[PDB]
Structure 1
């Protein structure tokens, strides 16, 4: 039934400054801005506290599937804050039993050529979502590093190269190859 009220709080840290034009949070700090719109979620994004310390999200007269959004907005702002402060760092290790998936970034991070996958002549070119920047790591041999602020864009770009390197018309239990996400960490930990 209609729950008379639900809410939550999102305690912003003193480094970051968040601001909300209505229902369109914009979060800025060390690394950069991250806007996100929630016109489509239907909530009261109050912002309270001197020093602007916490973001509150009411949701009045919600039914079960309307009250399910409350936390997911709150959480999306949490990631947004993390992105601004620390920034996300997805690491993905290449795997093969023969053909050593030859990776090479191109423009800056943007492009990812993925040559010699399974001994295929086809060279996979994979763009990155605006903001994300791939880079071939050191201190680990067959391993990529995708860094960026907007987690959504990062993890999508990770998937983009994960599904790029897919095996068709074979026993995938046998043929375990491709560039898989190994670790979802941050650019700096504190």
Structure 2
């Protein structure tokens, strides 16, 4: 239909300074800085004031309009990543074989080392992404805490850990073992 104009309004909290130049967003907050390139989308930005930014698509068709609120949401996730952080909690689910999860360091790199998953002799290693912190929860038994400023990196590490512990050649309705994301929140509770 070629909608003449579609708009979205970013909301910038008090301590945050968004910074956009040629579709390269640099969001700065108390918790650090996050950057994102949006050069694959045709959008324009207008600073209404220090607390609002207009995101506009001119003469966009259905899909190009659809790509507008996703731009808004990505920048909003950047904003809330540098002011509240992100925290994904993973629970260790096993029927018989305890899952032995350690945070090891080999070759100067951090790894999450899963052992004894379903009794297997194989040792699973998941590389920890830059800017992402892993921790074995003390307050909860069999819990892994994935935290960081970037929601994408945090959720992708959580997904890596969950996906590497898939059950093969069994009825997965019966063999429910694995490591699953149980809580998706923020570092700073609200």
User: TM-score if structure 2 supplies the norm length?
Assistant: 0.96
**Structure 1 unmatched runs, 5+:** none
Q: Secondary structure at the match of 1:147?
A: strand
Tell me what 2:137 maps to: 137
1:152 aligns with 2:159: no
* Whole-angstrom distance in 2 between the partners of 1:150 and 1:110: 17
Tell me what 2:67 maps to: 69
The question of whether the paired residues in 2 share the 8 Å contact of 1:109 and 1:134 is answered with: no
**Structure 2 unmatched runs, 5+:** none
TM-superposed CA distance for 1:109, in Å, is: 8.6
Tell me what 2:57 maps to: 59
TM-superposed CA distance for 1:103, in Å, is: 0.3
Q: Indicate how the Cα distance of structure 1 residues 28 and 38 shifts in structure 2: closer, same or farther if over 3 A, else same.
A: same
- CA deviation vs aligned residue, 1:156-179 (integer Å, no higher than 9, x gap): 100101011111101101100011
Tell me what 2:25 maps to: 25
Q: Secondary structure at the match of 1:75?
A: helix
Runs of 4+ in 1 over 4 A off after TM superposition: none
* Whole-angstrom distance in 2 between the partners of 1:134 and 1:151: 14
Alignment of 1:96-175 (within 5 A): 96-107=94-105, 110-175=110-175
Q: Secondary structure at the match of 1:78?
A: helix
* Whole-angstrom distance in 1 between the partners of 2:43 and 2:188: 32
* Whole-angstrom distance in 2 between the partners of 1:147 and 1:110: 14
Q: Secondary structure at the match of 1:162?
A: helix
- Number of corresponding residues: 188
User: TM-score if structure 1 supplies the norm length?
Assistant: 0.96
Q: Indicate how the Cα distance of structure 1 residues 88 and 138 shifts in structure 2: closer, same or farther if over 3 A, else same.
A: same
TM-superposed CA distance for 1:129, in Å, is: 1.6
* Whole-angstrom distance in 2 between the partners of 1:160 and 1:29: 28
* Whole-angstrom distance in 2 between the partners of 1:109 and 1:27: 27
- CA deviation vs aligned residue, 1:59-93 (integer Å, no higher than 9, x gap): 00011001001100001111101100000000000
* Whole-angstrom distance in 2 between the partners of 1:56 and 1:109: 41
- CA deviation vs aligned residue, 1:11-41 (integer Å, no higher than 9, x gap): 1001111111221110011111000011111
Alignment of 1:88-103 (within 5 A): 88-103=86-101
1:9 aligns with 2:9: yes
